[PDB]
């Protein structure tokens, strides 16, 4: 039990109630043109008639066809010079490099200090409750005691307590899958991809892989791609843990030999304790990985978690847990037991209106084809 | 954290300020023809109607069909002799052999007491300063202490120190990737490719590699090609390290075991320490590799670093570091923390503006297809 | 402080404050006590004034002037509470004079 290994806890000693989080704050190149005599290392921006522009670095001090007054002719000369390696391209890189040039030369004593670009802020949380009832009967309880000498209600209580703990852990996962951003999107797309869904039977998603062996590894590859996007947006780091369906976990477990575990002492001893509430292990040796036992379809979500409870992107503050209830239902006089909790949750706002599909600490991907 | 692993330092005792760098200095084989009997070990030139010319070494003293007055027939006889192993084709392996022959043969002591390929020189290093301001609210600090017993400002300081360290090493990398020459060019560019970019989905770049598995290895190969170009131009040997985006590093990490840590300690201990500040590992057992945590888009750079600080290709000479700031601003009476540094940087001359796209110690390539 | 104008057809809502400049005797700031539509056919300022006045007579609309400007200022400032840099001074200068005996 306990899903909080992957969220800030920041337990409250009162409801209502608050948590803290490490929220981050958040080029006029010469055009390449006919007759331009390039200079090695310099970058020119060329507009092709098709597909916009490119940024080209001269490796060769070459004049680009002075008679090419026809953009089409110029485009052809450029393509040839590019094929020849005379002109080469790193688009976003070059934009950065010229900015560095400009800023370096434009430096001035002034007062050019920069801020420690983190809002570092707080949110208010109500210790929202959850609860369950035993909904059991005397014929059962009477017989459990009469037949096995069983403590009857005590077991029903143990089941019920387990169930509420599992249900809250499920809720933690549901919130992650609520607030997580759509993965396999934007920066994490393969140009020929299906936008947000990983299909193990699809040559693009599996990157041409053969059999299950490589298709399974290809999923792990997409997972690393997602982990990076988390790092990029959060400014905190690569996703550190994964929540995924039984199908996905079993798939991932088939690779890297010793990443996910069965808690194999279990099978060895003939089901000594199934502990179906725990982390499988560490995926790739890098991601703490847990099974979403209630996965609705089939999926995985990659998330980040630092040692600092303010560095989770999601929080759970267990003010109250397992408070028992006792009574009966006069409609049939059947006995009543139950358990309630109070905790309060929240996320890094990044602006639950601002939570849905917006939380930079998590990327959610739909899985098909297993 | 520091990125000194790949820089010369020669720390300053005064600003402006200077460091030293190892500024570098900066054949008609007789034609094979119809009726000619070859001499074993000798080499002849032959231009085939298709393919063109190669140098052919005789293993057999064979007359090449005196009746082959038809170039097509002559090519055919030669082809047969090649199949026979009588004539074996090589291009530069032979061009050098003839140059060596000629140099030996017409050699004379003369007076070639030429200089080593060096000049050695020095640059003036301005201890450019950088300042980071915590810019935090007192209310936050009060609540962190009041709510969780947190040290607040002390912790904000830890963030601050970390951020300035990150900014400094980030800057070092930005200059590397400004002075680096664009790779996947010249000697390292296949004529049919994309000039400056390695696309993992492109059969030319991936050398026909099957799926992501082999495509990933194909990049590793391109890295060796870039490493060699560095050796060719610098004369100090091949690239020794890699600076690369999180996508590239994760890709490289998928092969050959020792490429990177998995940050397994983090996951193993339940989110203890992400340690995202040090070299990932060694690519192929050859290139010391580290993540550019601020990569703008996706790219990698291969670079050389000698044990002699003067052989780094880039210099960082810390003068002042992590000097703390304490103060406040009465207009809102907010407390102030911050840090100053002074260091100064430089690049092997290769003759800001004087380093852009010129530095042979590094080769930068844009990445697509991950 | 830029109260919404009261106008024909407007359904005023209780507690909300509207501004209305009458053809005669300047303006008022009216707080709805009753949710009500101000004669949608009153496109004639003369009619609109008559309707607003009628609603005022009805007790539907009640005026206070600076008292409401103060409340809306609080509304706005409260919602916009932040650090500009804003600290306010103790509202005193405290000074001295030289006097001969």
Swiss-Prot record, chain C:
Source superkingdom: Viruses
Modification after translation (UniProt): A proteolytic cleavage by the prohead core protein protease gives rise to the mature major capsid protein during virus maturation.
Function summary: Major capsid protein that self-associates to form hexamers, building most of the capsid in association with pentons made of the capsid vertex protein and one dodecamer of the portal protein. The major capsid protein self-associates to form 160 hexamers, building most of the T=13 laevo capsid. Folding of major capsid protein requires the assistance of two chaperones, the host chaperone groL acting with the phage encoded gp23-specific chaperone, gp31. The capsid also contains two nonessential outer capsid proteins, Hoc and Soc, which decorate the capsid surface.
Record-stated family: Belongs to the Tevenvirinae major capsid protein family.
Subunit structure and binding partners: Homohexamer. Interacts with the portal protein. Interacts with the capsid vertex protein that forms pentamers. Interacts with hoc; one hoc molecule associates with each capsid hexamer. Interacts with soc; this interaction reinforces the capsid structure. A total of 960 subunits of the major capsid protein forms the 160 hexamers.
Name of the protein: Major capsid protein
UniProt gene name: gp23
């Amino acid at each position: 039990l306990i899903a909080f290994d992957i969220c800030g806890v920041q337990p409250m000693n009162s409801p209502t109630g608050q948590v803290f989080a490490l929220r981050a704050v958040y080029k006029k190149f010469p055009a390449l043109a006919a007759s331009t005599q390039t200079t090695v290392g310099d970058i020119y921006t060329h507009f092709f008639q098709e597909t916009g522009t490119v940024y080209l670095q001269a490796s060769v001090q070459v004049t680009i066809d002075a008679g090419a007054t026809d953009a089409a002719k110029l485009d052809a000369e450029i393509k040839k010079q590019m094929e020849a390696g005379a002109l080469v391209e790193i688009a976003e890189g070059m934009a950065t490099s010229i900015a560095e040039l400009q800023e370096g030369f434009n430096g001035s004593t002034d007062n050019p200090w920069n801020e420690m670009g983190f809002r570092i802020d707080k949110q208010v949380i109500e210790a929202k409750s959850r609860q369950l009832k035993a909904a059991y009967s005397i014929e059962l309880a009477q017989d459990l005691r009469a037949v096995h000498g069983m403590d009857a209600d005590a077991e029903l209580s143990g089941i019920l307590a387990t169930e509420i703990m599992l249900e809250i852990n499920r809720e933690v996962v549901d919130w992650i899958n609520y607030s997580a951003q759509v993965g396999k999107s934007g920066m994490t797309l393969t140009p020929g991809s299906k936008a947000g869904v990983f299909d193990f039977q699809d040559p693009i998603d599996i990157r041409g892989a053969r059999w299950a062996g490589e298709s399974f590894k290809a999923l792990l590859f997409q997972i690393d791609k997602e982990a990076v996007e988390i790092a990029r947006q959060t400014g905190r780091g690569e996703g550190n843990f994964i929540i995924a369906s039984r199908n996905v976990v079993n798939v991932l477990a088939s690779v890297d030999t010793g990443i996910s575990y069965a808690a194999q002492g279990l099978a060895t001893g003939f089901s000594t304790d199934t502990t179906k509430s725990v982390f499988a292990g560490v995926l790739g040796g890098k991601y703490r990985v847990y099974i979403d036992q209630y996965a609705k379809q089939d999926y995985f979500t990659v998330g980040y978690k630092g040692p600092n409870e303010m560095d989770a992107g999601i929080y759970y503050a267990p003010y109250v847990a397992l408070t028992p209830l006792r009574g009966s239902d006069p409609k049939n006089f059947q006995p009543v037991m139950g358990f309630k909790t109070r905790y309060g949750i929240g996320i890094n706002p990044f602006a639950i209106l601002n939570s849905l599909g917006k939380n930079a600490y998590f990327r959610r991907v739909y899985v098909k084809g297993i």
